[PDB]
């Protein structure tokens, strides 16, 4: 197993209300877990526990190896689009190009005279929200890691573009990698190896899309 939570309860503030309550899941190496639920359910907090910024008050957590995290808030630092995606990692043309293509950024980049050397975050180009989200996702996916934590990475994208990048990047390009994707979309839950639906900190549902279908619903 690559990631396990067993009976996990946690608090952001000592003596407050628990942000996660008796959470249970297991991800094997190379699987995809979809984490769903309404605002404030605790999805980002769950990711924060995996990254060690929130310790459990009850229960056990297992995870090993380096993590690549994609925030639900897209961000850019001053530098070229290539520098923003590589972001200090060693450069490889094939790897970079595969990520760019999987994130539909090659069409964006091909339109600039400076191509991948277009400068962002310095007052020149002002990117759309969808462009910033895909750059942020590409940055997280380019990093080599054992576990990818993708927190609602499809912000500002229309539903078809989201579907295409979910398939090309999360399912195809990242097929061999252990992935936790915070997402609410039906196809993502259907393609995930496991689904965890959170509601106000608790496990609303945990299992497979097929199991949920068999309950009616």
Ligand X SMILES: Nc1nc2c(ncn2[C@H]2C[C@H](O)[C@@H](COP(=O)(O)OP(=O)(O)OP(=O)(O)O)O2)c(=O)[nH]1
Residues marked as binding for ATP?
12, 37-44, 72
Spatial separation of the C-alpha atoms in residues 1 and 109, rounded to whole Å: 39
Binding residue for ligand X, selected from 14, 15, 39, 55, defined by CB under 6 A: 39
Binding residue for Mg ion, selected from 36, 44, 70, 153, defined by CB under 5 A: 44
Q: Which of 217, 67, 30 is nearest to 141 (CA)?
A: 67
Spatial separation of the C-alpha atoms in residues 104 and 168, rounded to whole Å: 9
Residue placing its CB nearer to ligand X in the complex, 81 or 149: 149
Write the DSSP symbol of residue 110: H
Q: Residue 140 interacts with ligand X (CB under 6 A)?
A: no
Residue placing its CB nearer to Mg ion in the complex, 72 or 184: 72
Q: Residue 67 interacts with ligand X (CB under 6 A)?
A: no
Compute the least distance from the CB of residue 198 to ligand X, in Å: 6
Spatial separation of the C-alpha atoms in residues 162 and 153, rounded to whole Å: 9
Q: Residue 45 interacts with Mg ion (CB under 5 A)?
A: no
214 φ/ψ angles, rounded to the nearest 5 degrees: -70, -15
Q: Where does this chain bind ligand X (CB under 6 A)?
A: 12-13, 19, 37, 39-45, 72
């Amino acid at each position: 197993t690559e990631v396990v939570m067993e009976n996990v309860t946690a608090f952001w503030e000592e003596g407050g209300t628990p942000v996660l309550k008796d959470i249970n899941f297991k991800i094997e190496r190379g699987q995809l877990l979809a984490v769903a639920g309404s605002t404030g359910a605790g999805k980002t907090s769950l990711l924060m526990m995996i990254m060690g910024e929130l310790e459990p008050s009850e229960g056990k957590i297992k995870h090993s190896g380096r993590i690549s995290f994609c925030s639900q808030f897209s961000w850019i630092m001053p530098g070229t689009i290539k520098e923003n995606i590589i972001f200090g990692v060693s450069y490889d043309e094939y790897r970079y190009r595969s990520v760019i293509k999987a994130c539909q950024l090659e069409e964006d980049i091909s339109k600039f005279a400076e191509k991948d050397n277009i400068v962002l975050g310095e007052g020149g180009i002002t990117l759309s929200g969808g462009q910033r989200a895909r750059i942020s996702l590409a940055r997280a996916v380019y990093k080599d890691a054992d576990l990818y934590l993708l927190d609602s990475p499809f912000g500002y994208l229309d539903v078809l573009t989201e579907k295409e990048i979910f398939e090309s990047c999360v399912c195809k390009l990242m097929a061999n990698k252990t992935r936790i994707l915070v997402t609410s979309k039906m196809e993502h839950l259907k393609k995930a190896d496991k689904i965890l639906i959170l509601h106000e900190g608790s496990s609303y549902f945990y299992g497979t899309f097929s199991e949920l279908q068999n309950l009616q619903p």
